[PDB]
Amino acid sequence: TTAAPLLALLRENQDSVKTYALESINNVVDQLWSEISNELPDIEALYDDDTFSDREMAALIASKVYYNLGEYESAVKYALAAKDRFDIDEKSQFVETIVSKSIEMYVQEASKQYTKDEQFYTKDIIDPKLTSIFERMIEKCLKASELKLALGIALEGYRLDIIESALKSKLDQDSTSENVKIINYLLTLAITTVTNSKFRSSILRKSFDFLMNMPNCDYLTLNKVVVNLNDAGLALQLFKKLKEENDEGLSAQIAFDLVSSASQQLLEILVTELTAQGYDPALL
Amino acid sequence: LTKSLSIAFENGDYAACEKLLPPIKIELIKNNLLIPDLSIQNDIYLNDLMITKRILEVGALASIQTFNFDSFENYFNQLKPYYFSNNHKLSESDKKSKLISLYLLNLLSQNNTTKFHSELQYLDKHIKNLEDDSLLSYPIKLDRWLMEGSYQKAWDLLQSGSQNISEFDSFTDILKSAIRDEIAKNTELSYDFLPLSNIKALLFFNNEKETEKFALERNWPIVNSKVYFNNQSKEKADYEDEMMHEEDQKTNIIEKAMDYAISIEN
Amino acid sequence: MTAAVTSSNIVLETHESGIKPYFEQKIQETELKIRSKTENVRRLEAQRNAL
Amino acid sequence: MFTYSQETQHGNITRGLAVGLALINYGRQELADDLITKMLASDESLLRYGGAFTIALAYAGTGNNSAVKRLLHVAVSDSNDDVRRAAVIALGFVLLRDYTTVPRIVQLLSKSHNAHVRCGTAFALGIACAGKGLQSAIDVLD
Amino acid sequence: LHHSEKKYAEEDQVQELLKVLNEISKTTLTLDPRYIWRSLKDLSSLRNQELLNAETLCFTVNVLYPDSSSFKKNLLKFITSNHKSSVPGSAELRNSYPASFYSVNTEKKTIEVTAEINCFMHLLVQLFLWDSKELEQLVEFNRKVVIPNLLCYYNLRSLNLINAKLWFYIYLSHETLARSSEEINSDNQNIILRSTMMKFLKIASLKHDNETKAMLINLILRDFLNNGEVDSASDFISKLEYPHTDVSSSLEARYFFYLSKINAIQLDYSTANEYIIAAIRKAPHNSKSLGFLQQSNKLHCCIQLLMGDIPELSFFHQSNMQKSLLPYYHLTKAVKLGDLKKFTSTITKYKQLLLKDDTYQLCVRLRSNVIKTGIRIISLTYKKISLRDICLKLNLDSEQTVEYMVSRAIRDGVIEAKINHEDGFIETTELLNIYDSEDPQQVFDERIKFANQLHDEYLVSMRYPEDKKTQQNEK
Amino acid sequence: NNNSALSNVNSDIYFKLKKLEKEYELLTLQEDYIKDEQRHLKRELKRAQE
């Protein structure tokens, strides 16, 4: 067979003739794509018409043709311009490829704007529809019940809000021990993976806050965070929680690791600020 | 519905058929849904396919006479997979030979022999042997006479077109002007000036005045009954040959020396 | 090795199987660099050894 | 520190201040970039020597692709024997996060004709592989 | 007797098993496994024949089966159902060995590393069916199974090397059946055959494997040539994805043969030369390959002549292929002499032979070349001869005929003359020097670029064995 | 089948590997800068012949 009759049937005036013709193309859109590439400006013409009512399939047929050639770039753009046809993409396991590329496209754009603005996924600088597909992939991963795939994808596109929402639903205080391991998998990650000064700082900070919300935690864990950011104001808050939860044993154990590991500059500033908290001279 | 086309055709109005053909293409959707679209053709599906076939052939023939090249292209295309499917189920009709000849005439009349040879390799298997040559003979011999530059045979073929006259006339007019054009292209380089009567003879006209009218269209001055290519040939080639996308690429002598140079030390 | 003889919850199992080589494809286009690297680094290094 | 370095020609003094410019920058990372370029573009040996160590101390504790490209250029591009040494030492410090990459780099830099380059390779593996032993490192130092 | 044959055969198969399983379980070794597989397969098809034709079946019996027992049972039963300990899982000689598939592990379905092995077992089977010519139902059945079976895998690079070879037989068995005899069945499955290759080629780009990719492009270019769809072959060429990175020399050689055919029917001759010569050079020069060389050598005559250069008389003379290229020698001689009558006589007598090789369609066009040469000859000899005399000599119809051949010849510049109709002769305008033209510059550029090309090719290649001996211990 | 937490272990490789590619990219730096060393070592060969 050849798909050339279907393209010829596009040219005829009735809308009814053309809508049927585009569907026939879809049966053999990756399976007989050769002619469609050459006569491609017709399918695009039908998208550009606003009186044509099967715009959505014309954008899809086009999308597919650009995917087959090797031209990933325009396949993604047309993906978002269909205005749907994302249902098709879940029911196609041989082309989740362009779904993947939509992630690539988000993460390059996200990283670009991160340096110049704190947020840009709230602003209209990034296209909302491209954003929607991104968050959709992160859910798919969690439909397989793996949190590991979801934090991975989220990290790149510099989303703090997804990272928080993910940790939070899988924290329920099943055990005190079990909440810490996930956070520690994350803390060590942000140190060795994200070399970005600003985004790394935000992640470490949200991990302090989840254990800080808990009434009982590994404080051992929290100590790592203090030292790497090399910030006295974090430790100052940690000792204040401990003031009202005091034990002769618990205090002494955190303090011994802390003075060893902490830097010289850090320790000078801190002993000043603990006097104003009213904390004991024994700590000092 | 389908019978409206049928009676319109016999009557001799091909405008009536043309404008009336798109309402019928609504009914060609439904026809298509009855059959499996050539993944099997039984005698259950053959009577249903006969109508789809019957409507497409006869639309092709009306369109050539009313000069709708556009509509012609539609038919051309659709017709192909129906003839192509099976060795014989419904792949045999007299109008099959008829249409094959017209499609090919149409490829010559655009003056692009590339679309012709592509079609010719596709035709040479089943289709060409099955129908045999018996109007196929015509567009194939013609084309051959054009590779040769034997326009005496090519021009002669048009005349023998009279015997099968129906709608081959709508291409023959296009072909004459082209046959005359190919000769004029040749005459420029061959020689430079010729008496009026010898140019007439070559370009095929029965009157000296019709020769000078084709002169003015092809932008060539006959003065004192003599054509000149010493000016003209050089002029036309220059305006065309002026381009700014491969004229800054010629490959300099200087450029070639440099190019060699770096290959030796790298 | 992956199966697709049986599927459950309306191709949920094999929806996940399809997207795991596509996640790793990002990493495989970077591995095609490292695979011409192995040949060219050993090539210029032996060149450096005769010098 | 930079100005009084240019003005004096005293040998002991000038050495001290080029090192001091390197000292004060530590954990700066990508905020040492202006200082690094200026020093490595001075024609004095002393300011080139400390520039190598500006990259070392700043980009310590974190591995970078950048820091490595810039110090390989220094050893090759300068023919003064101390500047060649300084550039090798500096690789150790950046690369004490993953200290199992270090023998693999400096294997190459121990095939060197220049004895200074060879002498600095010792200190880099020293710095990386100080805290935990490594069996790969012994083979290079042999 | 029958029991004996099975054990003797199975043992031989275990040896081969060991070699390939070690490679894939020790991480891909890429180029290396493709080399190992071909050599083992040549040995094995030949083996299959002697000592019973249940040789394939024995291997399936002592290994785990995700789906391999089912296929082997279908094949056996067809070729007369037989019981001799030949119902897979019957005989046990794995004995808790990871190699030969651990006993315990299989039940649970803990091990599932049969996949690649499965490709290979099928692969022997396709080839044994082909040698036999008991293709028919057996071949169609294998083909049935194997399409959902690859889509059940989410493929790996080692497995793509094997399925690139399965794909070779899958195209071919359809061709074999269709080539017996036109069947209504044949038509339905052609359109199917095209679709599936296309679809799989898109997946095999992403997995990033050269063998699956190159092979599929080749099968599809050949599919296009049979159906006369030059347009679909062109858009296909224009896809551009044909790699050179690791592709075998078998796949490139076939690749260039197709290129030569595709350009010549659409009226480009220039670019067909390079490839028809390239395609002879990549192909080796064996007796088992002689047939492929006969195909190339027939094509080399048309392609060369239409461009307007006469191919060696010598090349066809001093071959062993001289009898195949006997009608074709007679084409070359006709063109040379310029004699119309000769060329027409040739193509009538040998018409049945010429049609098979698909050189005949090119021959209709080669008619045109005969005529130009006849008048070319007259122009070189004779500077001034009346067009009256030219007509007599080549036996042309009128004074108008003789003019219009010569007139077209000079548009393309082949004769290069000027016609005078008012001085009653043709006068040659031949300068016939090219030493005081800017032309030599243009020739020497190609020669120099080719030479440097080779200097780099020596340099790159030289190092790699040197590196390997250095890795190995020596003094 | 009857195995789960193959997805737990496969995802572990999905994290490790992202950072394991950064390591071998320093080994791609060796190729860039044995050009520099070799180029300059032609100059050092002219020094040794003096």
From Swiss-Prot, chain B:
Record-level GO cellular component terms: nucleus; proteasome complex; proteasome regulatory particle, lid subcomplex; proteasome storage granule
Positions in coiled-coil regions: none
Record keywords, A-Z: Proteasome
Gene Ontology process terms (BP): proteasome-mediated ubiquitin-dependent protein catabolic process; ubiquitin-dependent protein catabolic process
Keyword Ligase listed: no
Keyword flag Cell inner membrane: no
Pfam families xrefs: CSN8_PSD8_EIF3K (PF10075)
Domain PCI: 70-245
PROSITE patterns noted in UniProt: PCI (PS50250)
InterPro entries in alphabetical order: 26S_Psome_Rpn12, CSN8_PSD8_EIF3K, PCI_dom
Domain of life: Eukaryota
Protein function: Acts as a regulatory subunit of the 26S proteasome which is involved in the ATP-dependent degradation of ubiquitinated proteins. Necessary for activation of the CDC28 kinase.
Family of the protein in this entry: Belongs to the proteasome subunit S14 family.
Miscellaneous note of the record: Present with 9890 molecules/cell in log phase SD medium.
Name of the protein this chain belongs to: 26S proteasome regulatory subunit RPN12
Taxonomic source organism: Saccharomyces cerevisiae (strain ATCC 204508 / S288c)
Lineage: Eukaryota, Fungi, Dikarya, Ascomycota, Saccharomycotina
UniProtKB/Swiss-Prot annotation, chain D:
Entry PTM: N-acetylated by NAT1.
Region of the whole protein represented: 501 to 642 of 945
Protein name: 26S proteasome regulatory subunit RPN2
Role: Acts as a regulatory subunit of the 26S proteasome which is involved in the ATP-dependent degradation of ubiquitinated proteins.
Subunit structure: Interacts with UBR1.
Family the entry assigns: Belongs to the proteasome subunit S1 family.
Additional observations: Present with 4750 molecules/cell in log phase SD medium.
Species whose genome carries this gene: Saccharomyces cerevisiae (strain ATCC 204508 / S288c)
Positions annotated as PC repeat: 16-49, 50-85, 86-118, 120-142
Protein origin, superkingdom: Eukaryota
Curated annotation (Swiss-Prot), chain E:
Function: Acts as a regulatory subunit of the 26S proteasome which is involved in the ATP-dependent degradation of ubiquitinated proteins.
Domain PCI residue range list: 253-433
GO terms assigned for molecular function: enzyme regulator activity
Subunit structure: The 26S proteasome is composed of a core protease, known as the 20S proteasome, capped at one or both ends by the 19S regulatory complex (RC). The RC is composed of at least 18 different subunits in two subcomplexes, the base and the lid, which form the portions proximal and distal to the 20S proteolytic core, respectively.
BP GO annotations: proteasome-mediated ubiquitin-dependent protein catabolic process; regulation of protein catabolic process; ubiquitin-dependent protein catabolic process
Post-translational modification: N-acetylated by NAT1.
Modification Phosphoserine, positions: 437
Listed SMART domains: PAM, PINT
Gene name for this UniProt entry: RPN3
A GO cellular component entry from the record: proteasome complex
Additional comment: Present with 16700 molecules/cell in log phase SD medium.
Keywords from the named record: Acetylation, Phosphoprotein, Proteasome
PROSITE patterns: PCI (PS50250)
Designated name of the protein: 26S proteasome regulatory subunit RPN3
Compositional bias ranges of the Basic and acidic residues kind: 463-475
Family (UniProt): Belongs to the proteasome subunit S3 family.
From Swiss-Prot, chain F:
Compartments, record wording: Cytoplasm; Nucleus
Superkingdom classification of source: Eukaryota
Protein modification: N-acetylated by NAT3.
Cited function: The 26S proteasome is involved in the ATP-dependent degradation of ubiquitinated proteins. The regulatory (or ATPase) complex confers ATP dependency and substrate specificity to the 26S complex.
Family: Belongs to the AAA ATPase family.
Identification of the protein by name: 26S proteasome regulatory subunit 6B homolog
Species annotation: Saccharomyces cerevisiae (strain ATCC 204508 / S288c)
Parent-protein start and end of this portion: 35 to 84 of 428
